[PDB]
Design an enzyme around this catalytic site. Structure first.
Site, short mmCIF file in Angstrom:
data_model
loop_
_atom_site.label_atom_id
_atom_site.label_comp_id
_atom_site.label_asym_id
_atom_site.label_seq_id
_atom_site.Cartn_x
_atom_site.Cartn_y
_atom_site.Cartn_z
N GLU A 1 -9.27 -3.88 -6.62
CA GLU A 1 -8.54 -3.42 -5.44
C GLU A 1 -8.91 -1.99 -5.04
OE1 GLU A 1 -4.29 -2.78 -5.76
OE2 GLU A 1 -4.48 -2.79 -7.97
N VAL B 1 -5.41 -7.06 -4.29
CA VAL B 1 -4.77 -7.81 -5.37
C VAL B 1 -4.37 -6.82 -6.44
CG1 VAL B 1 -4.97 -9.76 -6.96
CG2 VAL B 1 -6.42 -9.65 -4.93
N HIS B 2 -3.08 -6.79 -6.80
CA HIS B 2 -2.59 -5.75 -7.69
C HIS B 2 -1.90 -6.36 -8.92
CE1 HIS B 2 -0.91 -1.86 -8.86
NE2 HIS B 2 0.31 -2.35 -8.80
N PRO B 3 -2.13 -5.81 -10.13
CA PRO B 3 -3.04 -4.73 -10.51
C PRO B 3 -4.42 -5.25 -10.87
CG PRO B 3 -1.00 -4.79 -11.88
CD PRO B 3 -1.24 -6.13 -11.26
#
Ligand SMILES: Cc1cc2nc3c(=O)[nH]c(=O)nc-3n(C[C@H](O)[C@H](O)[C@H](O)COP(=O)(O)OP(=O)(O)OC[C@H]3O[C@@H](n4cnc5c(N)ncnc54)[C@H](O)[C@@H]3O)c2cc1C
Ligand SMILES: Cc1cc2nc3c(=O)[nH]c(=O)nc-3n(C[C@H](O)[C@H](O)[C@H](O)COP(=O)(O)OP(=O)(O)OC[C@H]3O[C@@H](n4cnc5c(N)ncnc54)[C@H](O)[C@@H]3O)c2cc1C
Ligand SMILES: [Br-]
Ligand SMILES: [Br-]
Ligand SMILES: [Br-]
Ligand code: NA
Lengths: 487, 489
Positions: free
Chosen positions: B467, B461-463
Site C-alpha cells: 500500500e 489494502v491495509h496493513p
C-alpha cells in the site's frame, strides 16, 4: 467555549485524515474528539481509531505471530531440525509486544496534535447539541458533566462501528474482538461465532496460540463462511482451516450461553447441540456507532440499517454536518474511511469537489492462508453483464509439496466481462495474496483487460505470475446462468 | 536408418525452446523436433530437458532460498512469543538438496511424458548443431567429430541453447566452482567465497549463510564499489547493509588474482590487493555467456554480435532467413519469462499469421536475496538521461513487524520513478518481504502506461507493504536535465 471551522467526533482512520488535511492543507481551525487517549479497556478504541487500537494493526501483528506455528513445522521439509517438544507459544509475550506497538502509535498521534497548528484534541464524548454546536461530556450519558462546547461551521461524524451482539440468553457471558485483544491467557477451547473476516482471522490466531489439548471451533449460521468473497475461495479456505485443526460448524447458531461451575461456558445451539468452551467470541457483525451522538437534537437522518445517511459527497440531510467511515455502514475498511475523509475536506475547503469511488476497492483477509481480492465476484458480475468469463488457476505450489502442507492450494481467479475482456474482479487465496492484489487495484483503474494481464511478462518464480498465464476461460455465465461452454 | 523431417527443429529444450515447440505443435499443428543433451537434472551437463531455470536455475534456487529463509523465521518467531530450544537447531543441507533433487526430477519426468504423449512434438537426446540451412545434426557429444545419432530436416530452425557460467582465467581456476556445482555440494561449506556482485552471487550468499555449519562464514566479493549494478542505487546500498547485518561479509573493490590449495586441502585465495582469504569453496558467479560454440554456426553463416550472442532483429530472426534465436543465446535480458515470451511471439509470427515482437521494456523481475528485490522499468539515473524532468517518490522505513521480530535492519524500500512532465511511471523498485509478489501486477500497470495519479488514486489494502505504492503523492526529489535536486527551480 471555542470556535472552529471543523469539529470531528472520532479520532479514527477517517476522522484524523479529515482533520489533519483540513488543518495542514487548507489552514483551517480543527478540533477532534475521542473518548480515550490510548488503547484498551474500558473503551477499547481510542485516539487513532479502531484499526490502530483494536483492529487492523494489532490483529496483523497477532496473525503474523500465529503464522510461526506453520513456519516451524514447515521448516522441517527444508532440512531444519530442532526439538519440537520444546516448542511453546507464549501468548502473554505476544500481547505485551502488541500492546507496546499500539501504545507507541497512540503517543505518536499525541505528538502530532501537539506539533500541528490549528489541530486540537479534546478528550470525552461528543454529541450534537445544535446544528453548529458539538458538546463534549465526561461519559456517554447525555446528563454527564459538560467539559467543552465547540461551535463549528462544519461537523464531521466519524465515530466508527461497534461489535453487534445477538439478543440471546447469556449474551453477557460472551466477548467480542475488543476483549480478545486483552485476554490474560490464550483460551484452551474457544468458539468464534460468525462467518466473516474477524471470526476467521481470530480462529487462526487462537488456533496457533492454544495450550496443549486445545481446540478452536468456528460456527456460522448459514452453509458457507465468508459471504461476499469468491465462492471457490470460501470453500478452499474452509478446507485449509480444517486441515490446520479448526472445526467449522456451518448451519449452526448459538441459542443461549450459560456459566459452568469451573468458569467455562456452556453453549446451546438452535439445533440442540451443545459445546463447552472457555471463551465464546461473538463476531457476527459490526454496527454504526450512532447512539451516543444525539442525532435527534438536530435531525440527522439514519438509514433503515442504522447508518448515518449520506450522499456521494458524505453530506447528511442537515447542512454543514457530514459523516464518513464505518458510521455510514458501507465499506468498513480503514483506507476507505481515509479516502472519504480526504475527499470530504477537498470538497468543503478546496475548490474541487471529490467523491470516493467505492467500486474496485482491493481488500484482504488475514486468514491462514490469506485472501486478497479486488472487484466483483462472478455471481454479482453475472447479474450485471450478459456474458461473464471466469479464468481459474488452482494448485498446491511446489514449496508446499516440500513443506508438507500439501493442503495449501493457491487459488487465482479473474472475472471478466467476456464481451470486451474487461477485468471485473480478481480473487486470490494463498501466501502473499494481500500483497499481490494491491497493484491489481491500480490495474482496474486503467480498464485492464484479460489480455493486458496475459501479455505482461511474468516474474518467475512467484505465485503472482499465475495472473499473467491465464488465456482461456474455465467457464462462463450467460444471462446469469453458469455454463462450461458459450452457447 | 532414415533422417526425420520437421517444420521446426528446436535446439535446446529450455524455457524458450519448449514454449516455442509446444505452441507450434499444439496451436498450429506443426511437426516439431526438440533437442537436448540430458533428460534429467545434474552432472555431467547440469541443464537438461526443461532448461536452465528448471534444472539448475530459478526453480531449485527459489526452493533453496525458501529453505534459507527459515533461519530468519526461527529467530524472528521469538519476538512474537515463540519459545524453543535454540541450542537444538540444525540446518540439514543434505535434506534440502535431496528434497530439491526430487522436485526437479518430478518436473523432468513430466516433460518426458509431454513428448511421449503429444502429436507432432518429438524429443531427441544429444548435441544439436547446424550442418546446413535445413539440416540439424544430433551427435553424441559437443565434439563435432563425435558419432551422429540423428539428422533432423527442418524448414525452420530455432536456436535456444541458453547460456553458461563464465570463469575468469586466473591461476588455480580449477579449484573453483560455478552455480552448477553449487546445487550438488555434498555438504554445506563452512567457509565460502562467492565472487560476483550480481543476483546469482547474492542469492547463493544468502543460501550458504543459512545452512553453514557451526563457526562458518560466507564472504561475497565484488570487483567494483557497489553490488547489484543495474538495480536501484538506494536498494543496492540497503541490500548491502542487510546482508552484512545477517552476518555476510561483503568485500567490494576486491577481485581474486589466484587460488591455491593449502596443505589441508582448503582454498587459499589471493586478491589483486594482496589480501588473502582461506575458504572451503570458491563459487564464481561473475557472468553468464551465450552457448554458441557447439552449434557450428560457421556452417551456415549465422552472425554473432561483438559481444558473442546470436544477432537477432526484433522478430528473433538471424541473418539466415529461416533460422531464429531466442533466450539467453541472444545475450540480452537473461530471464526465463522473456525467453518464453520470445518463443511464443516467434511461433505466432512464423506459423500463426499474427506477427508479434517481444517488448523488452518494463519487464518485471526479482532478486531472491534475503530480503528480496522486485523491480520493473527504469532506474532513476537512466531515466534522467532520457527525460528532461524526472520525479522520484520514495518511502523507506523498518516495518512494524520487524520492530517486534528483532530484525530492525530490515528496511522496506519502495520507489516510483516518473516522467514528471506528464506523470507516467517509468519504473518501480522494491526491497523487502513480498517484493517479488508485489511487483508482478506493477508490470501490468506499466504496460498500461499508468501515471503516478493512477497509483495514488487507488485505495490501499491495509496493513500491507504494497500500500506504500498507493500513498505517495509528493516527490521526494527530482532530476532536472540530469541534475538531482530536492526541489524544482
Ligand atoms: C478486529 C478488526 C480488524 C480489522 N481489520 C481491518 C483490516 O485489516 N483492514 C481494514 O481496512 N480494516 C480493518 N478493520 C476495519 C477498520 O478498523 C475500520 O474500518 C476503521 O477503523 C473505521 O474508521 P472510522 O474513521 O470510521 O472510525 P474508527 O477508526 O473506528 O474511529 C472511531 C473513533 O471514534 C471514537 N468515538 C466513538 N464514539 C465517540 C463519541 N461519542 N465521542 C468521541 N469519540 C467517539 C472511538 O473511540 C474511535 O476511536 C478492522 C476492524 C476490526 C474490529
Ligand atoms: C543460478 C541461476 C538462477 C536463475 N534464476 C532465475 C530466476 O529466478 N528468474 C528468471 O527469470 N531467470 C532466472 N535464471 C535465468 C534463466 O534460467 C534463463 O534466463 C532461462 O533459462 C533461459 O532460457 P533459454 O530458453 O534461453 O535457455 P535454457 O532454459 O538455458 O535452455 C537451454 C537448453 O539447451 C540445452 N543445450 C545447450 N546446448 C545444446 C546443444 N548443442 N544441443 C542440444 N541442447 C543443448 C541445455 O542443456 C539447456 O537445457 C537463473 C539462472 C541461473 C543460472
Ligand atoms: Br451461505
Ligand atoms: Br548437512
Ligand atoms: Br496524484
Ligand atoms: Na453467525
Amino acid at each position: 467555549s471555542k470556535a472552529f471551522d471543523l469539529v470531528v467526533i472520532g479520532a479514527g482512520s477517517g476522522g484524523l485524515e479529515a482533520g489533519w488535511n483540513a488543518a495542514t492543507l487548507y489552514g483551517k481551525r480543527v478540533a477532534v474528539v475521542d473518548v480515550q487517549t490510548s488503547h484498551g479497556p474500558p473503551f477499547y478504541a481510542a485516539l487513532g481509531g479502531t484499526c490502530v487500537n483494536v483492529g487492523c494493526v494489532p490483529k496483523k501483528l497477532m496473525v503474523t505471530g500465529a503464522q510461526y506455528m506453520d513456519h516451524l513445522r514447515e521448516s522441517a521439509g527444508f532440512g531444519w531440525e530442532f526439538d519440537g517438544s520444546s516448542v511453546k507459544a507464549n501468548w502473554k509475550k505476544l500481547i505485551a509486544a502488541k500492546n507496546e506497538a499500539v501504545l507507541d502509535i497512540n503517543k505518536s498521534y499525541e505528538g502530532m496534535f501537539n506539533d500541528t497548528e490549528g489541530l486540537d484534541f479534546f478528550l470525552g464524548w461528543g454529541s450534537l447539541e445544535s446544528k453548529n454546536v458539538v458538546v463534549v461530556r465526561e461519559t456517554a450519558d447525555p446528563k454527564s458533566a459538560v467539559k467543552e462546547r465547540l461551535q463549528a461551521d462544519h461537523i464531521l461524524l466519524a465515530t466508527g462501528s461497534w461489535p453487534q451482539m445477538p439478543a440471546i440468553p447469556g449474551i453477557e457471558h460472551c466477548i467480542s474482538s475488543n476483549e480478545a485483544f486483552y485476554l490474560p491467557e490464550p483460551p484452551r477451547r474457544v468458539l468464534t461465532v460468525g462467518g466473516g473476516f474477524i471470526s476467521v482471522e481470530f480462529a487462526g490466531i487462537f488456533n496457533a496460540y492454544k495450550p496443549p489439548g486445545g481446540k478452536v471451533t468456528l460456527c456460522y449460521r448459514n452453509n458457507l463462511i465468508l459471504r461476499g468473497f469468491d465462492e471457490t475461495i470460501r470453500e478452499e479456505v474452509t478446507k485449509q482451516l480444517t486441515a490446520n485443526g479448526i472445526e467449522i460448524m456451518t448451519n449452526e447458531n448459538p441459542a443461549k450461553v450459560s456459566l459452568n461451575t469451573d468458569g467455562s461456558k456452556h453453549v446451546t445451539f438452535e439445533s440442540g447441540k451443545t459445546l463447552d468452551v472457555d471463551v465464546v467470541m461473538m463476531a457476527i457483525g459490526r454496527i454504526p456507532r450512532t447512539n451516543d451522538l444525539q442525532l435527534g437534537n438536530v435531525g440527522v437522518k439514519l438509514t433503515p440499517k442504522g447508518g448515518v445517511q449520506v450522499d456521494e459527497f458524505s453530506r447528511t440531510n442537515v447542512p454543514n454536518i457530514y459523516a464518513i467511515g464505518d458510521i455510514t455502514d458501507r465499506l468498513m475498511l480503514t483506507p476507505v474511511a481515509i479516502n472519504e475523509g480526504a475527499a470530504l475536506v477537498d470538497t468543503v475547503f478546496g475548490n474541487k469537489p471529490r467523491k470516493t469511488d467505492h467500486t474496485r476497492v482491493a481488500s484482504a483477509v488475514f486468514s491462514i492462508p490469506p485472501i486478497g481480492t479486488c472487484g466483483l465476484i462472478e455471481e454479482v458480475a453475472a447479474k450485471e453483464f450478459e456474458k461473464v468469463a471466469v479464468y481459474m488457476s488452482s494448485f498446491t505450489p511446489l514449496m508446499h509439496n516440500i513443506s508438507g502442507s500439501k493442503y495449501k492450494k493457491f487459488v487465482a481467479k479473474i472475472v471478466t466481462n467476456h464481451s470486451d475482456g474487461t477485468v471485473l474482479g480478481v480473487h486470490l487465496l494463498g501466501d502473499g495474496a494481500p500483497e499481490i492484489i494491491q497493484a491489481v487495484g491500480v490495474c482496474l483503474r486503467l480498464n485492464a483487460k484479460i489480455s493486458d494481464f496475459y501479455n505482461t511478462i511474468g516474474v518467475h518464480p512467484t505465485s503472482a505470475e499465475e495472473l499473467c498465464s491465464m488465456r482461456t476461460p474455465s467457464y462462463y455465465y450467460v444471462k446469469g446462468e453458469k455454463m462450461e461452454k458459450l452457447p
